[PDB]
């Protein structure tokens, strides 16, 4: 899809008005399937490890999030289509430069490839960036062909602040989602009863990320 039009005429107004934006059929079936195969190859070869939290304390991470993950830069062998996904995400964000709130987006995390391996795993209600670590936009791509949420669950429920309805996002094949990462969008992954895959990148606001890095580097 042409990035300029999609960014400026849809993603920008949707993000500013609602803080959440869904783009269905982002890359098309062939590319989505190739991504699914690359992800399943990562799973099958033991690459995933338990998802972790910003601040680890007495409780097991698995009491909080039951997913297993790996980080992808985009250039690894066997991850070329994930890299194309990431570049397509980046292209949309670059065409949004300066139009997403007051943020100035100069960078992002690596891609987090995540799997909830059925069995009722999920993620308790939480905020992606509650204390100002730099993350301003969460971008997620779903690649679950044949997902039937009424049976397998796995719905991402977002509680956008100040709204009269919450937002239920099925983890549908080839769906791209953006939302503000801060406290405006508490959210949860409801229990999944089938293997559920998603790829996430978080985009950074330059000034907030600089302050967060200064805090980390000074203790």
């Amino acid at each position: 899809l042409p990035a300029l039009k999609l960014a400026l005429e849809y993603i920008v107004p949707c993000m500013n008005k609602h803080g959440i934006c869904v783009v269905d059929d982002f890359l098309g079936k062939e590319t989505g399937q190739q991504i699914g195969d690359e992800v399943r190859a990562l799973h099958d070869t033991g690459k995933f490890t338990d998802g972790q939290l910003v601040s680890q304390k007495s409780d097991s991470s698995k009491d909080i999030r039951g997913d297993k993950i790996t980080w992808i830069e985009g250039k690894e062998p066997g991850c070329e289509t994930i890299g194309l996904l990431m570049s397509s995400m980046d292209d949309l964000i670059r065409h949004c430069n300066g139009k997403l709130g007051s943020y100035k987006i100069n960078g992002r995390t690596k891609a987090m490839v995540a799997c909830y391996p059925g069995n009722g795993t999920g993620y308790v209600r939480h905020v992606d960036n509650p204390n100002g670590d730099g993350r301003c936009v969460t971008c997620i791509y779903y690649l679950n062909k044949d997902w039937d949420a009424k049976v397998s669950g796995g719905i991402l429920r977002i509680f956008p602040e100040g709204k009269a309805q919450f937002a239920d996002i099925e983890p549908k094949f080839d769906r791209l989602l953006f939302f503000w990462s801060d406290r405006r969008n508490p959210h949860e992954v409801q229990p999944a009863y089938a293997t559920r895959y998603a790829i996430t990148v978080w985009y950074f606001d330059a000034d907030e990320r600089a302050r967060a890095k200064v805090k980390y580097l000074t203790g």
Binding site: G51, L53, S55, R94, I105, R108, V127, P130, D133, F204
Partner: peptide
């Protein structure tokens, strides 16, 4: 109130971030 960072998904704080 609960420290929400104990529920937030980890990202690396060191190294670089990917620059756009």
């Amino acid at each position: 109130e609960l420290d929400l960072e104990t529920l937030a998904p980890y990202i690396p704080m060191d190294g670089e971030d990917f620059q756009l």
